[PDB]
Every structure is written in structure tokens, then in C-alpha cells.
RNA sequence: UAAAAAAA
RNA sequence: UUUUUUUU
């Protein structure tokens, strides 16, 4: 339940951004895929009032009602990479549920460019959750899946194709050099 | 197949058409990703610069459909030889459109449109783009009950029947349905310079 | 005052 | 979302 404009307003993030200065917020998009009966659920979480979308989505999965029998391959396409503390909350919530396997794909490597958020997401890609930045498909996946692809179109048909490619080309090599 | 059909490929298209006796030609170049189901195309009118709606030409641009790995991609395997396809579109007000096309990328199209009413939504340009239409596939045949949006409300319906035949025999797949969405990304006032975007993905029936 | 690119 | 460097 997103807007086509909001997609590029929050997911598209270049090295030097657009004409308005830093009008950017954090979003998360959880795609829970129960493969038992092929019963998928989807949802977006804005960075709410002093509770990062990771914690909000954790509490959503908590208070929604889980099924301890089967395993879930949950993908999560988020705009801005999670910070240090919520990443550790995420890995502690994932260690308590062995029936969960999570993939994290971010659009931009959001952090305070200090030390804590460097290894805060290095434990994920090395212990439980393969964390890589978005490329072409995961954007194209999150584009029509989460953001409503209904009748109207807010003049963003393929403008992302070049911006998604720039973001991939730069930040994916950045994240690979970080993981290495 | 994957070694010759790279994840990014361009094409050139030449179309000769005649609508209600008005002859024209269109030259275009495009680019996209065949395995991800996205493509964009830029067209230019070279003759007759069009007295009719451009939307009747958009559904004619199919080798860029995303197929799962466990589903044989019938259209991709036809290359490098290519394929052909012939389409008949009968509009509800008597308009008829017959299209033939060869794909080898090099596309050669021959189009003939006849019996369009002078006060109909096609010749009067009262259309607002095509609605989403799920085409069920089962040579390969495809039938569409397509709906064209009207400016004043309602829909403008048409029956489309297309036959796709590959130049080389390959394994035919089972029953499936393809979700397709086409968008006009940019156009001038007289629709002489048009860019189009297409997304297509197959699903089990 | 615009914009291309790279490092932590 | 904060720094450092090169070029037009
Ligand atoms: Zn956080």
C-alpha cells in the first residue's frame, strides 16, 4: 500500500541526491513466504515514532501469531540499511526461531559512518542472514509487489532503471568490500 | 541459449502499415532485460507524419517475458533463428487490425487496419490506454478480451487472437497465464515520438 | 552555485 | 545521515 512517487522518494538514493535537501526517511518491506501451504503475507513498515521499522516489524511478527511447525523464508527489501542496535535485536530474535530464514536487501547503506554500524551488520551476513544491497531484481520485485502498481502512474515508469543501476554499481561494490 | 541471449539486449524494428488507406512506416530501437521481463522501446514515424490512436500499435511489441527456470522459455529458445506471429484484432465497432511480424534483433512488421468508424473512439482518439489483461496461453495460440479505457468513462472492448510460431521446434510447455502491463512513458502532442515500457511475467494456471 | 568519480 | 580527495 505505497505510492509510486514515494517509491523513488524513499528507495532511490544517489551519492548526491535530488534538488530538495535530505527529504528522506526509512522504510522496511517484509515479505513472509510460508511455503507449507504457500500462504504468503506482505507488509511495509515506515520508521515510526522512535521505534525503527526493524523493531516494529519484529513486534508485528510477534503479535501476529506464528506457527512453530514449518519454516519461513522471509525476504526483506528495505530502503535504508538497519543500524547497529536493531540488527542485534534482529539476530537475537532470529536465534530464538530456528524455523525462520531471513534475507535482507537494502537500497542504501545507511549508517553514521562510525565504527559500531560497521560490524553491526557484518555479523548478519556471516552468521544467519545473507545481507547484500539491492540490485535490479530486488528493486523490480519490491517495486510492483509492495508499491501499488495499479491504474495510475506517477511519472516514474523506468526512471529508476538508470538510478537503480547507479545505486547497484556503487553501493553493491561498497557492500561487497565491506563484507570482505 | 543463455550464452547468446545476454541479460541485456537491444533490438531494431521496422514496421510498414496502412490504416484506412493511410500508409505509414515506423522505425524503432529498444533495450531491456529478457530474463527480468522489463523492456523499453523508442519509436519514430518516418512516413505520414498518425491520424489514429497510437494505443492500437502498442500490443504488437513478446521475446521479453520473464519465465521461471523450471518453465521452458518457448520464445527465447527460438533464437537465433527467431519466430513469426500473426494477430487479428476485431474491435466492437467494426474496426479490424491484421498484423504480421517476423523476429530474427531485427523485427519486420506489416500492419493493415480497416473499417474504423470516423466517429469511433479509435479515429477520434478517445482512448486512455489499455487495461491490465491476463492472456491465457495453451504453434502457440493466445486470445484476449482486451478493454480500452475511455475518457468519458466505460471501456472499449476488442477481441484479439494471436498465433506465435517458432522457426525451430522446441519443447512446448504446459498451461500457464502471463500477466502483462504496458505503459506509455513519453510522447509528444501528435504521438510522433513515443517511448514504451513493458513488464511481463508468467504464472501457473 | 551545478555536476562526474573515488576512500574510510 | 556525517567526513576526506581528484576533475569539468
Ligand atoms: Zn535501528
TrEMBL record, chain A:
GO process terms (BP): clearance of foreign intracellular DNA; defense response to virus; negative regulation of viral genome replication; transposable element silencing
GO cellular component term of the entry, any: cytoplasm
Main location: cytoplasm
Top EC class for this record: hydrolase
EC number of the protein: 3.5.4.38
Annotated Gene3D superfamilies: Cytidine Deaminase, domain 2
InterPro entries, per the entry: APOBEC/CMP_deaminase_Zn-bd, APOBEC3H, APOBEC_Cyt_Deaminase, CMP_dCMP_dom, Cytidine_deaminase-like
Catalysed reactions listed for this entry: a 2'-deoxycytidine in single-stranded DNA + H2O + H(+) = a 2'-deoxyuridine in single-stranded DNA + NH4(+)
SUPFAM superfamilies: Cytidine deaminase-like
MF (Gene Ontology): cytidine deaminase activity; zinc ion binding
Necessary cofactors: Zn(2+)
Annotated keywords: Antiviral defense, Cytoplasm, Hydrolase, Metal-binding, Zinc
Protein's cellular compartments: Cytoplasm
Domain spans labelled CMP/dCMP-type deaminase: 2-124
Keyword Zinc: yes
Record family assignment: Belongs to the cytidine and deoxycytidylate deaminase family.
Protein name: single-stranded DNA cytosine deaminase
Biological source species: Homo sapiens
